[PDB]
Design a binder for this molecule. Structure first.
Ligand code: CHL
Ligand code: CLA
Ligand code: CLA
Ligand code: CLA
Ligand code: CLA
Ligand code: CLA
Ligand code: CLA
Ligand code: CLA
Ligand SMILES: CC1=C[C@H](O)CC(C)(C)[C@H]1/C=C/C(C)=C/C=C/C(C)=C/C=C/C=C(C)/C=C/C=C(C)/C=C/C1=C(C)C[C@H](O)CC1(C)C
Ligand SMILES: CC1=C[C@H](O)CC(C)(C)[C@H]1/C=C/C(C)=C/C=C/C(C)=C/C=C/C=C(C)/C=C/C=C(C)/C=C/C1=C(C)C[C@H](O)CC1(C)C
Lengths: 202, 223, 212, 229
């Protein structure tokens, strides 16, 4: 329902004879999950380049985003507090807890507010809906107290998210082809809009 | 009645019964009342020890501006009578007396109204009207109404908690005390900023005390 | 109601909560039959109790090996005991088989026939080899201080503590084995290395546990 | 009724019936009554041996200095042989101990003297014999039993303090107290050893090695020597 512009050429939200992971409840929910992770991905892949061009962070940091240690063939950064596998095991445990309790609220709605979790149970009651739990932490400030304002905010989240998903596919494509960063691509396209395009870099 | 942000609805267990109540609990930690009583007592303890620590670092830096409170704990940096003292025996004194007073306050939490009397001299007693507010010989001047003074106490205490962890944070970053860092920001506000001094911990990396080496700790991987 | 090993999923029908350590953890359904679950309860308690005794031996001998007392490390302890004493190996192994087979077989046939070892056939003893519950043989020999027959709710608390410490010691002994197989060192030497460099000395730097 | 923690509640099996009952049983080791009888007897016997032990060590260090009580068994001399003394102690203690244990397991069954049938010990309670064992009593038993268990608990703690202070310092109790009075800030257990997550330091053992007595070569280890601070 948020972002319902009627664009479905391949007919995947058909309720008749559905199942598996092709389902309205799974597809809309994975759409907002990809949207939120791609907003964070777009801001995170921009921010070192613009903060190193603005002169706010030093030049030991501000490296290109694919040289962070995501792809050690593309380049790594020594200066983290540990090795990237030592980081990645903490990521495994932390994201396992987070994503796995999120999965359990999707499969059993409201079931994350009974078993003792350090007093963190009223926070994870959720709603009668996936993708938008709310509560005192997932909705810190009560934004969307009006139902129409809540619909408008969901639609803005959908549109900013789809734009950031296109932007993150863009960051991957440009990063593979021209071998530079997206802010460097901004600088080159704003310097020479004619002589710096996709048609030049072939 | 004002809350921590406009438009936010306070929880149902936050009502105004406790002092300093802005309806702010985004994690729902005080949803169980026994846990809420425990965290109220821990809030009072952190607030009072942090007010004492801020007033400490403030007065120590004002009176003797060569102490450097972040290195005041060393045996060499001690006052006139005992300035090469045995830190073992010092910690022994502290362990015994603090374990005493701490277990007395813990039994006050467990059984409210059961450790008011002096166990040695049986004609002495403190009336505590609320938990965490002993009174009597702990309130010798006796201004206790009590509610607005409790609000002043918890607001000053929250500000001093933020201010003391600020003190430790600035002192690890730029290596100086709070008044010296304030004088540096007044000397230049654009240079000597948080934008520049961060990223380098001035933590001196496992100071050797008299026999043992303490591992040292910065709050962020500066190095 | 009760905390499950995996929050959100209901517990299985054969795990009710009457047992100590009952978290509803049986994803392979190995204990659907009540007799098989009874036998696995007793096997869990025996593995746990051996792991607690073994892990306490590992920890105390490793403390006495790092502090300079001359204690071996546990992967060399049996060889140095047999070689520094006047002990031949297979006779001590056979005497172990005799004593452990006697005691173990008493445990086996008290599982089979539940009150039958208290008949008096062993030397004269009656009701001191009768069990109290499955895997809980408390009489005068096995519970001499007598905690299972006073303050029954506190005894249920001790059953819970025993099962939790036993599972913790089973994964700790699997620890010591894996730690030795990776690093080739004493386990409290490994703990000293982790206290020395936490960020840099770990399983992601041993070069074995993740071979990438 | 005073408690080990003023304000708490005692366990439900502790009422105030026994002397020295201050409601201290965190592990619940006396919820069985049949166990609690045995442990009351064992508490009385440990307390009496420890009181006599602390009196022996104190009077020994006062009267005869330059004799270390941890090494009195080594440096004592007698024409009385060691196995002869051990045999006399073995038979006479086996006698006395089995008499007391028979009074425990059968209450009031060894009251009568076996040699002299005139003399019979009066009815009593277990642990508190009376009669010729108690010819002179000052005051009342309802307070003297409390005094006996308090002094005995304090002397049990005193004896394990003597053993640990002798193994860590190497001196007697009075000499160690003179050391703590000569340097109170500098001679404590906090002042000798500490464990930090970086490194740990333990005091050196002042009891050297296996002790060479007359051919036996008694091994003499220190108690939990890898676990001292
Ligand atoms: C509870 C309040 C309290 C606070 C906030 C601090 C904070 C500090 N102490 Mg201090 N101490 C405190 C109580 C005490 N200290 C000391 C005796 C010392 C010594 C001897 C040293 C400190 C050091 C430090 C620094 C921490 C560096 C570190 O290794 O930490 C992270 C790691 C761990 C906590 C482990 C910082 C100034 C060290 C220092 O000044 O050098 C930077 C230091 O060498 N303190 C004693 C006497 C036992 C205390 C009483 O409780
Ligand atoms: C090869 C034979 C085959 C066929 C004909 C099908 C057909 C189907 N599958 Mg099945 N499936 C298969 C193999 C197959 N699957 C395998 C091997 C697995 C295990 C991974 C599954 C597990 C599976 C699940 C969990 C689900 C299905 C579903 C479906 C139905 C809809 C899928 C769809 O069109 O969504 C469009 C497809 C996508 C959105 C995913 C495409 C991208 C993924 C990563 C696959 C990439 C394939 C590509 C060749 C990989 C290139 C790699 C290269 C670039 C390195 C359709 C009936 C769904 C269903 O039942 O709904 C009714 C459903 O939920 N399948
Ligand atoms: C400025 C912050 C502040 C405020 C407003 C209060 C207020 C109160 N305290 Mg608290 N207290 C504080 C700091 C504060 N305290 C600190 C830092 C500690 C740790 C030492 C305590 C430990 C404490 C105990 C043990 C008790 C109280 C009690 C009280 C209540 C009545 C006593 C009174 O009238 O003092 C009013 C406070 C002031 C007028 C502030 C004085 C400012 C000083 C003089 C500045 C000193 C200069 C500095 C050292 C440099 C009142 C709610 C008592 C109570 O509730 O009894 C029922 C009680 O028993 N407090
Ligand atoms: C918000 C995301 C973010 C992240 C993940 C990092 C990460 C890093 N910073 Mg950077 N930095 C940031 C924003 C961030 N920074 C901002 C907003 C500023 C201006 C205050 C800086 C100014 C800065 C300096 C001057 C230095 C770093 C350094 C570092 C590296 C070591 C950590 C450290 O000691 O810095 C301290 C930690 C911070 C500055 C982050 C706290 C503030 C953010 C907003 C919290 C979130 C690490 C890769 C160091 C480095 O590059 O080593 C060679 C270094 O010298 N940062
Ligand atoms: C440390 C955790 C632990 C706990 C909580 C228990 C608890 C229990 N045991 Mg178990 N037991 C354990 C370890 C433990 N055991 C180990 C390692 C073994 C193998 C040697 C056994 C072998 C065993 C037998 C044969 C029996 C019990 C029985 C019992 C039950 C009653 C006895 C009692 O209350 O002792 C309470 C336990 C403690 C207070 C733990 C003491 C901690 C020690 C002192 C640590 C230091 C030791 C180390 C070597 C140094 C109670 C549920 C009896 C029973 O089930 O009766 C119906 C029974 O017959 N246990
Ligand atoms: C010598 C052994 C010994 C024994 C058998 C007892 C037995 C008893 N004590 Mg006593 N107690 C002792 C020594 C002993 N005590 C000492 C030295 C102190 C001074 C610290 C006390 C202080 C004390 C108080 C205040 C009270 C008792 C009470 C009791 C009775 C009920 C508690 C119970 O059931 O636990 C049975 C106890 C045991 C089975 C002994 C524990 C054996 C474990 C396995 C060893 C653990 C000890 C550990 C290593 C620490 C050693 C000392 C340490 C400082 C190095 C019971 C008759 C209560 C009472 O009198 O009510 C009627 C009571 O209120 N005790
Ligand atoms: C008789 C030869 C002998 C010798 C030279 C040692 C020597 C040692 N023992 Mg060992 N010990 C022995 C027998 C011996 N032990 C026996 C038979 C037992 C089972 C009761 C133990 C139980 C034991 C434990 C639990 C520990 C030691 C520890 C130690 C070391 C430190 C000293 C100590 O804590 O006192 C010894 C400890 C005791 C509790 C005293 C018992 C020892 C006497 C001599 C037993 C005599 C009984 C025999 C039947 C006659 C030291 C290397 C400590 C260590 O560092 O281990 C890693 C330690 O934690 N011992
Ligand atoms: C009786 C000997 C002894 C002594 C004097 C100390 C003394 C100390 N320990 Mg150690 N500790 C000890 C035994 C001892 N410990 C043992 C046997 C262990 C293993 C269980 C530990 C495990 C331990 C840890 C994990 C830590 C300490 C820490 C400390 C320091 C605490 C300072 C403090 O928190 O004040 C207020 C202090 C130097 C702490 C430290 O090093 O901080 C500086 C710390 O983190 N201790
Ligand atoms: C609509 C429709 C309809 C019809 O029916 C059919 C069809 C056609 C099929 C459909 C379509 C679809 C589409 C188009 C899709 C697309 C998607 C995407 C692009 C995604 C991405 C997505 C993406 C995403 C999530 C992403 C994310 C990202 C991230 C996190 C990142 C991160 C990072 C950062 C920060 C920085 C550093 O350096 C590191 C990293 C790590 C690198
Ligand atoms: C439950 C379930 C259910 C579902 O249905 C399915 C599943 C999931 C499959 C399952 C799970 C399972 C598991 C996890 C298991 C594990 C186990 C273990 C680890 C054990 C150990 C166990 C362990 C053990 C006994 C151990 C023991 C030990 C010992 C004795 C030791 C000894 C020793 C010592 C002292 C020292 C020396 O010098 C040497 C030695 C000789 C070496």
């Amino acid at each position: 329902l948020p972002g319902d512009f009627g664009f479905d050429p391949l007919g995947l939200l058909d309720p008749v004879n559905s199942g598996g992971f092709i389902e309205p409840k799974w597809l809309q929910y994975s759409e907002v999950i990809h949207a939120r992770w791609a907003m964070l991905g777009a801001a995170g892949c921009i921010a070192p380049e613009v903060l190193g061009a603005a002169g706010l962070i030093p030049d030991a940091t501000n490296i290109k985003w694919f040289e962070s240690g995501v792809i050690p063939p593309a380049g790594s950064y020594n200066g983290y507090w540990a090795d990237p596998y030592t980081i990645f095991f903490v990521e495994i445990v932390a994201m396992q807890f987070a994503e796995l309790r999120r999965l359990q609220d999707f499969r059993y709605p409201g079931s994350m507010g009974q078993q003792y979790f350090l007093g963190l149970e009223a926070i994870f009651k959720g709603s009668g809906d996936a993708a938008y739990p709310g509560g005192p932490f997932f909705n810190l400030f009560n934004l969307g107290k009006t139902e129409a304002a809540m619909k408008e905010l969901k639609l803005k989240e959908i549109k900013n998210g789809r734009l950031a998903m296109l932007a993150m596919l863009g960051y991957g494509a440009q990063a593979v082809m021209t071998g530079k960063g997206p802010f460097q691509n901004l600088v080159e396209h704003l310097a020479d809009p004619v002589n710096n395009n996709i048609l030049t870099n072939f | 009645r004002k809350l921590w942000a406009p438009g936010v609805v306070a929880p149902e267990y936050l009502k105004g019964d406790l002092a300093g109540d802005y309806g702010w609990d985004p994690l729902g930690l005080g949803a169980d009342p026994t846990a809420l009583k425990w965290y109220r007592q821990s809030e009072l303890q952190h607030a009072r020890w942090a007010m004492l620590g801020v007033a400490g670092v403030l007065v120590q830096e004002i009176v003797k501006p060569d102490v450097y409170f972040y290195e005041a704990g060393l045996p060499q940096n001690l006052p006139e009578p005992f300035t090469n003292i045995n830190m073992g025996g010092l910690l022994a004194w502290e362990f015994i007396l603090m374990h005493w007073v701490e277990v007395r306050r813990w039994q006050d939490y467990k059984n409210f109204g059961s450790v008011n009397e002096d166990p040695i001299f049986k004609g002495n007693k403190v009336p505590n009207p609320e938990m965490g507010y002993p009174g009597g010989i702990f309130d010798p001047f006796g201004f206790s109404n009590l509610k607005e003074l409790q609000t002043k106490e918890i607001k000053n205490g929250r500000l001093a908690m933020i201010a003391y962890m600020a003190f430790i944070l600035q002192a690890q970053a730029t290596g100086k005390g709070p008044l010296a860092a304030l004088s540096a920001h007044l000397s230049n506000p654009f240079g000597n900023n948080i934008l520049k001094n961060i990223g380098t911990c001035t933590v001196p990396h496992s100071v050797d005390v008299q026999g043992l080496t303490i591992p040292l700790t910065c709050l962020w991987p500066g190095s | 109601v009760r905390p499950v090993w995996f929050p959100g999923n209901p517990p299985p029908a054969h795990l009710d909560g009457s047992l100590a350590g009952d978290y509803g953890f049986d994803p392979l359904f190995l204990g659907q039959e009540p007799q098989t679950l009874k036998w696995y309860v007793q096997a869990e308690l025996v593995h746990g109790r051996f792991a607690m005794l073994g892990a306490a031996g590992i920890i105390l001998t490793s403390i006495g090996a790092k502090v300079g007392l001359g204690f071996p490390e546990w992967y060399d302890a049996g060889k140095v005991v047999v070689e520094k004493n006047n002990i031949d190996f297979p006779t001590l192994m056979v005497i172990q088989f005799y004593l452990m087979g006697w005691a173990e077989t008493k445990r086996w046939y008290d599982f089979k026939n539940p009150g039958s070892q208290a008949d008096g056939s062993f030397l004269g003893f009656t009701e001191e080899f009768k069990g109290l519950e499955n895997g809980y043989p408390g009489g005068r020999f096995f519970d001499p201080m007598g905690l299972s027959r006073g303050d029954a709710a506190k005894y249920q608390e001790y059953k819970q503590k025993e099962v939790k410490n036993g599972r913790l010691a089973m994964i700790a002994c699997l620890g010591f084995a894996a730690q030795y197989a990776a690093t080739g060192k004493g386990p409290l030497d490994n703990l000293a290395d982790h206290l020395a460099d936490p960020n840099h000395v770990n399983f992601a730097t041993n070069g074995v546990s993740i071979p990438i | 009724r005073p408690l080990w923690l003023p304000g708490s509640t005692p366990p439900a099996h502790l009422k105030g019936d026994l002397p020295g009952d201050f409601g201290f049983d965190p592990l619940g080791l006396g919820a069985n009554a049949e166990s609690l009888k045995w442990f009351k007897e064992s508490e009385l016997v440990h307390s009496r041996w420890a009181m006599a032990a602390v009196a022996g060590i104190l009077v020994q260090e006062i009267v005869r200095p330059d004799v270390f009580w941890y090494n009195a068994g080594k440096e004592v001399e007698s024409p009385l042989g060691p196995l002869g003394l051990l045999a006399v102690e073995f038979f006479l203690m086996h006698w006395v101990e089995v008499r007391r244990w028979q009074d425990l397991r059968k209450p009031g069954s060894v009251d009568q003297d076996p040699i002299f049938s005139q003399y019979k010990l009066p009815p009593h309670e277990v642990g508190y014999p009376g009669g010729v064992f108690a010819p002179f009593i000052p005051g009342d038993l309802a307070e003297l039993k409390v005094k006996e268990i308090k002094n005995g608990r304090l002397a049990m703690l005193a004896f394990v303090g003597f053993v640990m202070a002798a193994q860590v310092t190497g001196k007697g109790p009075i000499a160690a107290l003179q050391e703590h009075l000569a340097d109170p800030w500098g001679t404590t257990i906090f002042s000798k050893a500490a464990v930090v997550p970086g490194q740990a330091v333990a005091p050196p053992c002042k009891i050297p090695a296996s002790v060479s007595y007359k051919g036996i070569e008694i091994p003499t280890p220190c108690f939990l020597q890898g676990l001292w601070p």
